[PDB]
Amino acid sequence: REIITLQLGQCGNQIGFEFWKQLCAEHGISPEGIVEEFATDRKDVFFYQADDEHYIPRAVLLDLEPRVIHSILNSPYAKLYNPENIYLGNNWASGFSQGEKIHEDIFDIIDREADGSDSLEGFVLCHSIAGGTGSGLGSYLLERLNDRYPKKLVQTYSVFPNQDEDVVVQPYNSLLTLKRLTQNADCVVVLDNTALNRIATDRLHIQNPSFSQINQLVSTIMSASTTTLRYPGYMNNDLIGLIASLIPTPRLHFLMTGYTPLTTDKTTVLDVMRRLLQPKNVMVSTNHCYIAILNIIQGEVDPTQVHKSLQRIRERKLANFIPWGPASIQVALSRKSPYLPSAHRVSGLMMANHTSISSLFERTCRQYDKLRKREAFLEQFRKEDMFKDNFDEMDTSREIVQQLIDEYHAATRPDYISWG
Amino acid sequence: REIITLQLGQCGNQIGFEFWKQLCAEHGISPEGIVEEFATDRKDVFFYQADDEHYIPRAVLLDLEPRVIHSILNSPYAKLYNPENIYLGNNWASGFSQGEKIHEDIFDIIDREADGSDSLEGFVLCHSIAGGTGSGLGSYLLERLNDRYPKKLVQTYSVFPNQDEDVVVQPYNSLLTLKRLTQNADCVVVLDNTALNRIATDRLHIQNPSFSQINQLVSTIMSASTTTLRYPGYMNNDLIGLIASLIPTPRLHFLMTGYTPLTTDKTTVLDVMRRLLQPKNVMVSTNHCYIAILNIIQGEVDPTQVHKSLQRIRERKLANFIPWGPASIQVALSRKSPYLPSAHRVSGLMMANHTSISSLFERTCRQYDKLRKREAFLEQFRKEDMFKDNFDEMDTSREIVQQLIDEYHAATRPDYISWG
Amino acid sequence: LHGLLLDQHEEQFSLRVEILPSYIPVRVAEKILFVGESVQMSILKNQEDTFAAELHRLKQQPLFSLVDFEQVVDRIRSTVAEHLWKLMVEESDLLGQLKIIKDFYLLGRGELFQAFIDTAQHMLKTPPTAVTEHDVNVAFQQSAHKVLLDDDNLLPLLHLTSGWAALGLSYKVQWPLHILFTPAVLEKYNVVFKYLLSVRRVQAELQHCWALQMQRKHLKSNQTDAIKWRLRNHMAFLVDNLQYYLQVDVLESQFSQLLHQINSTRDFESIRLAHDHFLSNLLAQSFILLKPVFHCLNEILDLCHSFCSLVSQNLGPLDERGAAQLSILVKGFSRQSSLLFKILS
Amino acid sequence: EYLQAMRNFFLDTMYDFYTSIFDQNVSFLNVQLQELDGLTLSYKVPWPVDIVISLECQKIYNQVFLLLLQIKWAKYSLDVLLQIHRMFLLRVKLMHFVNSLHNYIMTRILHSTGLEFQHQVEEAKDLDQLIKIHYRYLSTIHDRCLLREKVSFVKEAIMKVLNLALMFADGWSIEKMESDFKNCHMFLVTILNKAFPHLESLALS
Q1: How far is A272 from chain B (nearest CA, A)?
Q2: Which SS3 state, helix, strand or coil, does residue B333 take?
Q3: What is the gyration radius of the CA atoms in chain C, in angstroms?
Q4: Residues of C177-200 as b/e, b for ≥16 C-beta within 10 angstroms?
Q5: Closest chain A C-alpha to C304 CA, distance in angstroms
Q6: Bridge partners of residue C192, in order along the sequence
Q7: CA angle D113, D118, D123 (to 5 degrees)
Q8: How far is CA B365 from CA B131, B362, C46, C237, in A?
Q9: CB distance A79 to A104 below 8 Å
Q10: 3-state helix, strand, coil in chain D (%, to 5)
Q11: A203 CB near a chain B CB, below 8 Å?
Q12: Which among B34, B49, B51, B112 is the top mutation candidate for probing chain A, defined by the most A β-carbons within 10 Å of its own β-carbon?
C-alpha cells in the first residue's frame, strides 16, 4: 500500500532530494505537483494524492545545523512537496543525546503523516553512516521507529564510510550504527563509497564532484528498485513481497547492488543477465558465494527467448551459490518506464545476498581493534561517558558483529543445519 | 580448446606484446577489445570472451627489474588486455634462486587464470634463452609447470643465444636451460639469432634495430602457426593434433622454421612448395636429413592442381629423408586470413624435424667444453655454489645432451631399431 | 501454359507410357512434362499469348514436322527453366545452403563434431533407442552452446536408427524453395556423414593415446624391450593421416567444380545434372563406394579400433598379458598391409 | 479494450483486495471488491461483444483463476511469515518451489501467449475467425496449464504441497514435513522428467 520515507543528515537529505526530483522527472508531472496532459500508472506508493491534484511525496525531513536545508528551501522542488516537517554535533553520542530530548515532537511529525495516511506498508530510511549529524540521531530514531510499529518493515539505505584515509571516531560511530543496523533493521541495502568513487573515476575523470554524481547513481538505483511498484507490474508490487524471498535467515538481510551499464553519459537477454552476474559490474566491492540473487531488468527486451537465456546462463554455471537448502538466482522482468525520454534502454539491477560483505565488516572491525588497542583515538567526551560509563555498548556490538561474521562463515559451510 | 600463454624476460615480453598487437591488427577488433562492425571465425583459442564484449588475451606476465614493462604499461594495448598479472639478476643461478622464493604467488597467478578458464589445452612459453633475467627463472617455472599439470602440453619458443662473439657465463646458462628444455618440455621451436640477423642484413640494410624487426618475424611465424586454429580449418585445430604427427620419438621434438618469401617490405603450388623446401629459405641455420616435415600454406592458391604439384615435388626428389619407418613431408593448405589488408599473399610456413640442429648443439657444447677446460670463465658466485656445490647439474645436462646427440646421430643411421 | 491437370479422363502425376508418343521423339516428350510441372509451384505471364500464338499457328498447319515442333518446345523451355534458376540461387540462396550442407554432412566444419565426441564418449553400449536418442540431441546442442553458433540453428536434429552403429542426422530444407534437395539426396549425404565420423573418431583416439613422453617417460628411463609395442602407433597413424589429407583434395575439387557449373549455366535443368554428377563423384572418389577396397579399409579401421583399447588401458609401464593380444594384432597388420599393396597394383 | 481488461481481471489493485481476504460471506467479499479455493466473480458483457465472446470463455478464465489463487495463497502465506534455524531450512526448501511455479505459470505462460495473442487479433478482419483465434488462445493455455489430462498423476502432488502452506502457517512435526516434501517433490520430478511437451520447462530442479 502506502510507504512513508525518511531522510536525515545532509547526505540523506541530498539523496532524498535527488530521488524526489528524479521521480518528478520520470513521472508526467510539473515541479508543482500538477499532472501533465499526456498521462496510467500507480502513483500512491510514495505520493500523497494532495488537495490541488498535487502528488505530494510523503517524506520526513530531519535536520540538525541546517546548511543544505536552505538550498532545498529556495528551489522549485519545494513547490512539489512541503508537508512542513522541518525541525532543527558530529558525534554518535552527541547526535544520540540531541535526539534524546526532542523525540516527542519529531514523533508527532511521524504520527501526523501516520494518521494522514490511510494505510501503511513500510518505512524507508535515508541515513548516512558515520555522517556526523546523521550518526547517533539516526540510530536513536531507528530504535524508536521499530519500537513503536512492529507491524511494518524497515529498509535503510546505507553507505560504507571509509575513503581509505582522517576522522578517528568514525569506526566507533559506524560500529554503534551497525549494531542498531543489525538488530533494529529488517533489510539493509549497503553501498560502498570506495567502489562508487572507483567507478566514477573509471567511466569519467571526475573525483571532486563525487557527491553530486553519486546522487545520480543512488537515485537511479532507488527508482529502478521501485519501478515494478510504481508502474503496473505483477510481482513484488509491495515492499514486503520483495524482501521475503531474499532472506532465508532473519539476520542475513544485507543486499548487494550491481547495474549492467557502467557508463551512462541489439543485445540479448542472457548477455545482460551474464554481465549483471559479473562482480566487476557489481558496484559494491576460503570461499565467498551468493546465498540468493534477485534481478530486475528494464528495457527493450524480446520476451520469448528468456527461457533459452535461462538455460544458457544455467549451463554456463557461473556461481556455485550455496550448499544447504536450495536458493536460486531469480529473474524479474519489467517494462522500460514511459512518460520520460529514455537513453541507454537495457538496464538491469540485481539484489543479492552475498557473504563477501563480511570482509568489509572485518575491515572496519580491524580498524576499530587497532584504534581501541592504541587508545588515543577514542576522543573521550562527556557525551560518550554519560551515554555509557563503561563503554560496553561497544562490547555488545562487538559480540553481535562477531556472531554475524560467524553466521556468514558458517552459512558458507555445508553445515548450517546446526546454528552458529 | 583454450590455451594459456606465458611470457617472461624482456625479450619474451617484447615478442608477446608484438604477437598480441599483431593479432589485434589481424582480427577485426579495436585496441580496447571492442569488436568491429565488419566481422565469423574462432576467437577463443587465446582470447577470453571478456565482460564488455572484450576479447582479452590470456597472457601470463612475469618480470624482474621492470624496464620494458613500463613501456608496455603506457600504451593503448594495455586497454586490450590487463588481467593484473604483473609481479616483480642476470645469471641462471640468480634467476633460479629468485624464482625459488616467490613461486607460490606466481603460482596463484597461474591458478587464477586456470580456474578462470573452463577448459585447458596447453601452455605456450615465450622464453629467451640465456636472457639474463629470463634465464633460471624460466627454467624453474618450466619445471614447476610440467610438474603441476601432466595432462597438458608445453611449447617453448626459443632462440639460440650466440651473436658469434662477450658474456662468458652464457653457455652455462643456456646449457642448464637446455637440460630443462629437453626433459621438461614436449615441443621446442628453436630459432637462430644469427640466421635471423643474416636474413635481416640480407633483405635490408638494417643491423641496429634487429630486435624490433625480429619481433615482426617471430609474430608472423606465431600467427601463421595458429591460423588453422584461429580461422575455421579442418586439421590441427588443436595444438596437440599438430604436435602429434611431427614427433616419432619423444625426445626428437625440435622444430625447424622456414618461410617462402624472404623480403616482405602468378606463382603455382609446387613452386612455393619447392622454395619452402630449400634450406636457404629455411630461416634457422656425415649426413643430415629430415625426419618429417609439415608445411602450411596461406594465400591465393588454385586448389585443384595440388596433387600434380605433389607428384612433381615427389619426382623432383629433393631430400632423402629417412631410413627406418616411413615419414613424409606432409602438406596442409589454408586460406589467407581475412579481416585485414593482405600484401605478399602466397606465404608458407614449414615445421620440420631435422638432425642438423645437433651441429648447433655441438657448437655450444664445444664452447662450454673450452670454457670449462680453461676455468677462468665460470665466474664463481655464491648463487651457483649454493644451488649446486659440486656443479654436477652441468654433468647431468652434459650426459643428457650427449644422449641427445647420440639419438640424433643414431636416428640418422639406417638402424634405430636398436636404441641409442 | 496454365499447368492444368485433368487433361485425360481415360486413355506428382506424370504422363502414362502407353499413350506416350514415339512419333514425337522421346526427349522432346520429356521436356513437355517438365514445362507443365514448373507452373504448379514474372514475365511468364507476359509472353503467354505469344506461346498461344505459336501453338495456334501449329493448330493452323495441315502438316506435321518435328523439326518445327521442337523449336517451340525449346523456346518455351529456355524461359521456364530460367525462372527457377533466377529465384533459387539468389533468393533461396542455394550456394550458402550448400556450404551449410558441406559443413554438417561432408564435415566442412569438424570443430563441433570433435568436441561432440569429447562430451559423448559414454556411448559404447547397445542402445535401448529411447534414452540415448534424447541424450544425443541434448549433448549436441549443449556442445554447440559453449562457442560457435550461439545464435540460432536448431535446425539439425540427431537421432538413432554400439551407440554409433545406430546414428542419423537430419536437416529440414525449404521444400517448395528446394526441389533440387530431395530426401534421397539427403540419404546419400547421411551415408557419407557416418563414414566421415568413424574416421575422425578412431584417429582422435590414436592421437590421444600417444602421450608416451608426457606421462610415461617423464622422470623415468624406461625398460627397452618391455616398453615398446613395435611402435606400430606410428605405422597405423600414417595410413589415416594421409587419408585424412586425401579427403581434403577430394572434397575441395568437387565443391569447386559444382560452384563453377552452377555459375556458368542459367537454367535449373542443368543444375539437376551438375548436382547429380557431384554426389556420385563424392561416393566413388572417396572410395566409400562398395568395393573390395571398401572392405579392406573397414578391416583397417576395425584393427585400429581394437588397438586403441589395448594401448589405452595400459597407462604406466606394464608388460604382462598385453603381449598375447598384441601378437595377434601385428600378424593382422602384416595380413592387411599385403592387401594395401593389392590396392596399389 | 474490453477484451484486454477481461483477461486482465487476473494478472497491483487486486493485490490489496486479495491480501485483506487472507486474514466467509458473499457481501463481505463484495464491498471489498468494490473498494482454500473460492472467489466467484460475476460481470456483465455488452451484447455486441456477448455475441463474440463465448460463455465457456468465462468458465475457462474461472478455471485458471481458481488454480492460480492457490499459488497466490501459498505465496502470501510464506510472505507474512518472517533445531531453531530448522524452520528457516524448511522456509527456503518450499519458498523456492512456490516461486518457481509462480514464475512459470504467470510469466512463462500467461504473459507469453497473451503478448502473442494481442499481435494475433489485430490481423483478424472477419467476425468468424475472431472466435477461432480466441478459442486457439483458450485451448492452448488450457494445455500449458494442464487441466484436460493428468489430474491425478501430476496434479495430486501440486495439491498435496499446498497443504504444507496450510501446515507451515499453523506451526509459526518439522522433521516429518521435510520427510514428506523431499519424497513427493522427487517423485514429481522423476515423473515429469519425461513429459504436454512444454512441461519440460519445469523439469529443471
Answers
A1: 10
A2: strand
A3: 28
A4: beebbeeebbeebbebbbbbbebb
A5: 35
A6: none
A7: 120
A8: 18, 5, 89, 36
A9: no
A10: 70, 0, 30
A11: no
A12: B51
Residue of chain C with shortest Cα separation from B400: C221
The whole-angstrom separation of Cα A40 and Cα C216 is: 75
Backbone torsion region of residue D3, taken as left when φ is above 0, otherwise alpha when ψ lies between -120 and 50, otherwise beta: alpha
CA–CA dist D77, D85 (Å, integer) = 19
For chain A, the 3-state helix, strand and coil shares in percent, each to the nearest 5, are 45, 15, 40
| In the block, residue with C-alpha cell 525520454 | A341
Rounded CA separation C69/B165 (Å) = 92
Residue C211 sits at φ, ψ, to 5 deg, of -135, 35
- Kindly write down the DSSP assignment for every residue of B157-175, as one continuous string: EEEE-------SSHHHHHH
Is residue B235 helix, strand or coil? coil
A187's enclosing H/E stretch is strand A187-192
C-beta separation of A291 from A276 below 8 A: no
Resolution limit in angstroms?
A: 7.8
Radius of gyration of chain B (CA): 22
Q: Could you count the other beta carbons within 10 Å of the beta carbon of residue D119?
A: 9
Q: What is the C-alpha to C-alpha distance for residues B68 and B62, in angstroms, rounded to an integer? A: 12
Give how far Cα A248 sits from Cα of A140, A245, A356, B288, D96, Å: 27, 7, 17, 74, 10
Assigned C-alpha cell, B391: 656443479
Q: Quick check: C214 and B186 CB within 8 A?
A: yes
**Cβ-count burial of B280 within 10 angstroms (0-12 exposed, 13-18 middle, 19+ buried)?**
exposed
Q: Is D154 helix (H, G, I), strand (E, B) or coil?
A: coil
Identify the residue whose cell numbers are 585485414. B340
Residue B54 main-chain phi, psi, to 5 deg: -90, 135
Torsion, Cα of B258, B263, B266, B268 (10° steps): -10
Residues of chain A contacting residue B51, judged by C-beta atoms under 8 Å apart: 275, 278, 280-281
Q: How far is D172 from chain A (nearest CA, A)?
A: 15
DSSP string, B357-381: HHHHHHHHHHHHHHHHHHTSSS---
Coil, strand or helix: which one is A202?
Answer: helix
**Residue that the C-alpha cell 522549485 belongs to:** A76
**C-alpha torsion sign, points C86, C90, C93, C96:** positive
Contact B235 C244 (CB under 8 A): yes
DSSP state for residue A34 in the 8-state scheme: P
Whole-number Cα distances in Å, C125 to A75, C75, C303: 79, 61, 19
By C-alpha distance, the chain A residue nearest B54 is A275
**SS3 of chain C:** CCCCCCCCCCCCCCCCCCCCCCCCCHHHHHHHHHHHHHCCCCCCCCCHHHHHHHHHHHHHCCCCCHHHHHHHHHHHHHHHHHHHHHHHHHHCCHHHHHHHHHHHCCCCCCCHHHHHHHCCCCCCCCCCCCCHHHHHHHHHHHHHHCCCCCCCCCCCEEECCCCCCCCEEECCCCCCCCCCCCHHHHHHHHHHHHHHHHHHHHHHHHHHHCCHHHHHCCCCCCCCCCCCCCCHHHHHHHHHHHHHHHHHHHHHHHHHHHHHHHHHCCCHHHHHHHHHHHHHHHHHHCCCCCCHHHHHHHHHHHHHHHHHHHHHHHCCCCCCCHHHHHHHHHHHHHHHHHHHCCCCC
Q: What gap in Å lies between CA C272 and CA A188, rounded to an integer?
A: 72
Whole-number Cα distances in Å, A95 to A138, A143, A182, C163, D184: 8, 14, 19, 76, 56
**Is A397 assigned a ligand-binding role in the annotation?**
no
Rounded to 5 degrees, what are φ and ψ at B226? -115, 5
End-to-end, the C-alpha distance of chain B in Å comes to 37
Residue showing cell 593479432: B23
Say how many CA atoms lie within 13 Å of B263 toward its Cβ. Answer: 7
**Cα torsion at D178, D183, D186, D191 (round to 10°)?**
-150
| Distance (Å, whole) CA B240 – CA B121 | 8
Asked whether B248 and B292 are in contact (CB, 8 A), the reply is: yes
Neighbours of D36 (CB within 10 A): 11
